[PDB]
Write an enzyme that holds these catalytic residues in place. Structure first.
Site, PDB file in Angstrom:
ATOM      1  N   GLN A   1       0.792  -1.218   0.000  1.00 57.22           N
ATOM      2  CA  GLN A   1       0.000   0.000   0.000  1.00 57.22           C
ATOM      3  C   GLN A   1       0.832   1.281   0.000  1.00 57.22           C
ATOM      4  O   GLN A   1       0.332   2.313  -0.456  1.00 57.22           O
ATOM      5  CB  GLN A   1      -1.041  -0.004   1.117  1.00 57.22           C
ATOM      6  CG  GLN A   1      -1.913  -1.250   1.035  1.00 57.22           C
ATOM      7  CD  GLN A   1      -3.062  -1.241   2.014  1.00 57.22           C
ATOM      8  OE1 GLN A   1      -3.003  -1.911   3.053  1.00 57.22           O
ATOM      9  NE2 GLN A   1      -4.104  -0.476   1.706  1.00 57.22           N
TER      10      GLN A   1
ATOM     11  N   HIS B   1      -0.695  -4.959 -12.868  1.00 53.54           N
ATOM     12  CA  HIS B   1      -0.087  -4.896 -14.191  1.00 53.54           C
ATOM     13  C   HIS B   1      -0.882  -5.609 -15.268  1.00 53.54           C
ATOM     14  O   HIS B   1      -0.998  -5.110 -16.385  1.00 53.54           O
ATOM     15  CB  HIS B   1       1.353  -5.404 -14.160  1.00 53.54           C
ATOM     16  CG  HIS B   1       2.240  -4.592 -13.275  1.00 53.54           C
ATOM     17  ND1 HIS B   1       3.465  -5.037 -12.833  1.00 53.54           N
ATOM     18  CD2 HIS B   1       2.049  -3.386 -12.697  1.00 53.54           C
ATOM     19  CE1 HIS B   1       4.008  -4.118 -12.051  1.00 53.54           C
ATOM     20  NE2 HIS B   1       3.156  -3.112 -11.937  1.00 53.54           N
TER      21      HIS B   1
ATOM     22  N   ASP C   1       2.970   0.774  -8.000  1.00 52.73           N
ATOM     23  CA  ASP C   1       4.352   0.858  -8.473  1.00 52.73           C
ATOM     24  C   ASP C   1       5.161   1.894  -7.695  1.00 52.73           C
ATOM     25  O   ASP C   1       6.361   1.683  -7.458  1.00 52.73           O
ATOM     26  CB  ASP C   1       4.395   1.193  -9.964  1.00 52.73           C
ATOM     27  CG  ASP C   1       3.998   0.037 -10.859  1.00 52.73           C
ATOM     28  OD1 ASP C   1       3.639  -1.057 -10.369  1.00 52.73           O
ATOM     29  OD2 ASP C   1       4.035   0.249 -12.096  1.00 52.73           O
TER      30      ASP C   1
ATOM     31  N   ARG D   1       2.848   0.132  13.296  1.00 51.60           N
ATOM     32  CA  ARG D   1       2.591  -1.164  12.684  1.00 51.60           C
ATOM     33  C   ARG D   1       2.790  -1.023  11.180  1.00 51.60           C
ATOM     34  O   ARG D   1       2.128  -0.215  10.524  1.00 51.60           O
ATOM     35  CB  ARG D   1       1.178  -1.636  13.004  1.00 51.60           C
ATOM     36  CG  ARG D   1       0.796  -2.863  12.222  1.00 51.60           C
ATOM     37  CD  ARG D   1      -0.587  -3.354  12.546  1.00 51.60           C
ATOM     38  NE  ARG D   1      -0.865  -4.546  11.748  1.00 51.60           N
ATOM     39  CZ  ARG D   1      -1.801  -4.702  10.832  1.00 51.60           C
ATOM     40  NH1 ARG D   1      -2.722  -3.789  10.626  1.00 51.60           N
ATOM     41  NH2 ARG D   1      -1.836  -5.851  10.180  1.00 51.60           N
TER      42      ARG D   1
ATOM     43  N   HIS E   1       0.999  -9.265   4.722  1.00 54.21           N
ATOM     44  CA  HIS E   1      -0.142  -8.374   4.471  1.00 54.21           C
ATOM     45  C   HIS E   1      -0.457  -8.368   2.968  1.00 54.21           C
ATOM     46  O   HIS E   1      -0.568  -7.315   2.337  1.00 54.21           O
ATOM     47  CB  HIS E   1       0.130  -6.978   5.042  1.00 54.21           C
ATOM     48  CG  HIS E   1      -1.079  -6.138   5.291  1.00 54.21           C
ATOM     49  ND1 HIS E   1      -1.265  -5.470   6.481  1.00 54.21           N
ATOM     50  CD2 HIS E   1      -2.108  -5.795   4.478  1.00 54.21           C
ATOM     51  CE1 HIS E   1      -2.356  -4.730   6.374  1.00 54.21           C
ATOM     52  NE2 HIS E   1      -2.894  -4.916   5.179  1.00 54.21           N
TER      53      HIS E   1
ATOM     54  N   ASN F   1      -2.125 -10.716   8.321  1.00 55.67           N
ATOM     55  CA  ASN F   1      -3.188  -9.732   8.369  1.00 55.67           C
ATOM     56  C   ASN F   1      -4.399 -10.207   7.584  1.00 55.67           C
ATOM     57  O   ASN F   1      -4.309 -10.474   6.379  1.00 55.67           O
ATOM     58  CB  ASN F   1      -2.714  -8.412   7.757  1.00 55.67           C
ATOM     59  CG  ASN F   1      -3.815  -7.380   7.760  1.00 55.67           C
ATOM     60  OD1 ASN F   1      -4.143  -6.832   8.809  1.00 55.67           O
ATOM     61  ND2 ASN F   1      -4.440  -7.153   6.603  1.00 55.67           N
ATOM     62  N   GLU F   2      -5.532 -10.285   8.280  1.00 53.84           N
ATOM     63  CA  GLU F   2      -6.832 -10.536   7.658  1.00 53.84           C
ATOM     64  C   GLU F   2      -6.855 -11.687   6.657  1.00 53.84           C
ATOM     65  O   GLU F   2      -7.264 -11.506   5.510  1.00 53.84           O
ATOM     66  CB  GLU F   2      -7.375  -9.283   6.971  1.00 53.84           C
ATOM     67  CG  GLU F   2      -7.570  -8.122   7.909  1.00 53.84           C
ATOM     68  CD  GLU F   2      -8.485  -7.080   7.345  1.00 53.84           C
ATOM     69  OE1 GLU F   2      -8.921  -7.135   6.179  1.00 53.84           O
ATOM     70  OE2 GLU F   2      -8.787  -6.157   8.116  1.00 53.84           O
TER      71      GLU F   2
ATOM     72  N   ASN G   1      -8.690  -6.144  13.668  1.00 52.62           N
ATOM     73  CA  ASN G   1      -9.020  -5.046  12.773  1.00 52.62           C
ATOM     74  C   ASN G   1     -10.524  -4.881  12.812  1.00 52.62           C
ATOM     75  O   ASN G   1     -11.265  -5.809  12.480  1.00 52.62           O
ATOM     76  CB  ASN G   1      -8.571  -5.340  11.341  1.00 52.62           C
ATOM     77  CG  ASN G   1      -7.070  -5.405  11.168  1.00 52.62           C
ATOM     78  OD1 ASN G   1      -6.310  -5.270  12.122  1.00 52.62           O
ATOM     79  ND2 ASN G   1      -6.648  -5.600   9.928  1.00 52.62           N
TER      80      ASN G   1
ATOM     81  N   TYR H   1     -13.816  -2.230  11.833  1.00 57.76           N
ATOM     82  CA  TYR H   1     -14.269  -1.084  11.057  1.00 57.76           C
ATOM     83  C   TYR H   1     -15.771  -0.807  11.142  1.00 57.76           C
ATOM     84  O   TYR H   1     -16.156   0.366  11.041  1.00 57.76           O
ATOM     85  CB  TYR H   1     -13.939  -1.294   9.577  1.00 57.76           C
ATOM     86  CG  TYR H   1     -12.482  -1.125   9.272  1.00 57.76           C
ATOM     87  CD1 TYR H   1     -11.606  -2.205   9.285  1.00 57.76           C
ATOM     88  CD2 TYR H   1     -11.961   0.139   9.004  1.00 57.76           C
ATOM     89  CE1 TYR H   1     -10.248  -2.027   9.020  1.00 57.76           C
ATOM     90  CE2 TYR H   1     -10.619   0.329   8.741  1.00 57.76           C
ATOM     91  CZ  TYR H   1      -9.767  -0.755   8.734  1.00 57.76           C
ATOM     92  OH  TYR H   1      -8.448  -0.491   8.458  1.00 57.76           O
TER      93      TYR H   1
ATOM     94  N   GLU I   1      -6.016  -2.284  13.463  1.00 57.32           N
ATOM     95  CA  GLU I   1      -6.578  -1.329  12.507  1.00 57.32           C
ATOM     96  C   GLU I   1      -7.940  -0.866  12.976  1.00 57.32           C
ATOM     97  O   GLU I   1      -8.752  -1.654  13.456  1.00 57.32           O
ATOM     98  CB  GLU I   1      -6.781  -1.903  11.095  1.00 57.32           C
ATOM     99  CG  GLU I   1      -5.504  -2.339  10.431  1.00 57.32           C
ATOM    100  CD  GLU I   1      -5.654  -2.762   8.981  1.00 57.32           C
ATOM    101  OE1 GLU I   1      -6.657  -2.407   8.323  1.00 57.32           O
ATOM    102  OE2 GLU I   1      -4.729  -3.460   8.499  1.00 57.32           O
TER     103      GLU I   1
END
Ligand SMILES: O=C1O[C@H](CO)[C@@H](O)[C@H](O)[C@H]1O
Ligand SMILES: [Cl-]
Ligand SMILES: [Cl-]
Ligand code: NA
Length: 473
Positions: free
Chosen positions: A20, A40, A53, A78, A123, A167-168, A310, A312, A377
């Site tokens: 990310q 890509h 990228d 983190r 991740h 992660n997740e 995490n 949300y 998160e």
């Protein structure tokens, strides 16, 4: 004001993930991963045809990230490590010194600025060479994951004392449940996603045992895992709707947490039983849900020093079955909706339901015997802007609810990292959905990070160690 004050030892900070933020996707020996491949080869899957990228260019600009963490007053950062930056071939035959140097440079910069590193090993950025063997549905990846973790512990564990294996996996397993979704964008719903989960659980357990055997005595750190879960509120107060919400918890959180965090181990019974029945009814000789042997159940259970969560949002759940046959959603035996009255975000899936956070923390406390929970998160999306009042309100309400869980409900929450330190590549949403507390101009090659109102409010919370009066009920 007790209910508004953070415990003295509680750790506050912010979070990112490698694909990310880093960019430098093929620089200095880094090998390709499944997100390089997706963005890509399949730009049609991503808003704007965006790629990682460059992203925030944190491969080059990591000192700027540390600068803003220091401004924020973060106690913990983190971040994740890019597997293919360290082991370009996925296997451990080649270790990329540039990757080792990069993460050492970041770790050392954090420590020099009084910020503790918390490292996510995986991740979502699997090396393509491992995806070419089938990726997560192929159990051989559990040993490969162990070998990757050994490289991480050996190189970084003298200075890193907080680790998250994954992660997740609830989210990334879905990369095996759609031809147009999360990398690697494979359409094996109800079959390959379960195999992916199974491998991940095995991998996690191997990594934990590795730490015990090869590193813990010397390094003295803690190993957990970051699991996402939505609160699922019964659509009506009926026993039947309550049953459906319990199904949701078990099919989303319990899938991973029952094997690891309970005394019994194994998958939740409802998961095993519903998938077995559905598989039989559809004519399969064998259940679509993989099985653990008794020896594996014992190996996997107890492999944790804390639980990463995490959190949300929430859903409404009612009794019933929907979704395609086969699929995890159909197997789960709940009909999920959102309440139109809940405040919205810039993300279709994310509604603001702060009381759901408290409910979830209590569910976890009761199911898993009050494990130490680190909120790895929590955050909110908008489309842009520095005067991010929605994000400020999201944070102040969620932190208030978490503090009630701690002080009123006795939940052992030990830390919290906001998602995200800065606007970044939001997966299939590209740069269109903003989660940062710092804004980043993705049209400026220098990628300046500038504080939003939420960064200022979180700095105030971190400095004062309380919820400011103006945000209290
Ligand atoms: O749970 C998450 O939510 C975030 C927001 O969707 C995403 O960017 C992170 O990579 C992910 O771990
Ligand atoms: Cl009712
Ligand atoms: Cl005031
Ligand atoms: Na090495």
């Amino acid at each position: 004001d007790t209910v508004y004050t953070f415990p003295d030892e509680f750790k506050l900070g912010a979070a990112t993930a490698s694909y990310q933020i880093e960019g430098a996707w093929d620089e200095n020996g880094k090998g390709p991963n499944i997100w390089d491949t997706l963005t890509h080869e399949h730009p049609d899957y991503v808003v704007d045809g965006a790629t990682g990228d460059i992203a925030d260019d944190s491969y080059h600009l990591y000192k700027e990230d540390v600068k803003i963490l220091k401004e924020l007053g973060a106690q913990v950062y983190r971040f994740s490590i890019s597997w293919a930056r360290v082991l370009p071939e996925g296997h451990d035959n080649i270790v990329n010194q540039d990757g080792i140097d990069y993460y050492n440079n970041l770790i050392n910069e954090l420590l020099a600025n009084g910020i503790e590193p918390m490292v996510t090993m995986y991740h979502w950025d699997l090396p393509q060479a491992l995806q070419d063997l089938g990726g997560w549905p192929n159990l051989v990846l559990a040993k490969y994951s162990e070998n990757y973790a050994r490289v991480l512990f050996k190189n970084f564990g003298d200075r890193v004392k907080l680790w998250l294996t994954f992660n997740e996996p609830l989210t990334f397993m879905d990369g095996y449940a759609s031809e147009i979704g999360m990398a690697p964008s494979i359409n094996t719903p109800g079959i390959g996603d379960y195999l992916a989960a199974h491998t991940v659980i095995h991998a996690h357990a191997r990594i934990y045992h590795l730490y015990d055997q090869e590193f813990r005595a010397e390094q003295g750190g803690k190993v957990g895992i970051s699991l996402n879960i939505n609160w699922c509120e019964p659509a009506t107060n009926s026993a039947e709707d309550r049953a459906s919400c319990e199904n949701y918890q078990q099919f989303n959180l319990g899938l991973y947490a029952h094997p690891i965090f309970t005394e019994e181990g194994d998958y939740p019974a409802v998961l095993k039983d519903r998938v077995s029945r559905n598989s039989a009814d559809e004519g399969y000789t064998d259940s679509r849900l993989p099985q653990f042997t008794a020896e594996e159940v014992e190996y996997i259970r107890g492999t944790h020093d804390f639980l990463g969560i995490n959190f949300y949002t929430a859903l409404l759940g009612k009794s019933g079955v929907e979704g395609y046959e086969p699929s995890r959603y159909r197997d789960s035996g709940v009909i999920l909706t959102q309440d139109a009255a809940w405040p919205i975000s810039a993300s279709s899936w994310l509604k603001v339901v702060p009381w759901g956070f408290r409910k979830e923390l209590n569910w976890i406390k009761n199911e898993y015997n009050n494990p130490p929970v680190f909120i790895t998160e929590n955050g909110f999306s908008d489309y842009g802007g520095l005067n991010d009042t929605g994000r400020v309100h999201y944070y102040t309400e969620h932190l208030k609810e978490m503090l009630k869980a701690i002080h009123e409900d006795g939940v052992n929450v030990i830390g919290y990292t906001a998602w995200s330190l800065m606007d970044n590549f939001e997966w299939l949403r590209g740069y269109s959905e903003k989660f940062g507390i710092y804004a980043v101009d993705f049209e400026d090659p220098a990628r300046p990070r500038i504080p939003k109102e939420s960064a200022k409010v979180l700095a105030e919370i971190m400095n004062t160690r309380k919820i400011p009066e103006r945000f209290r009920d």
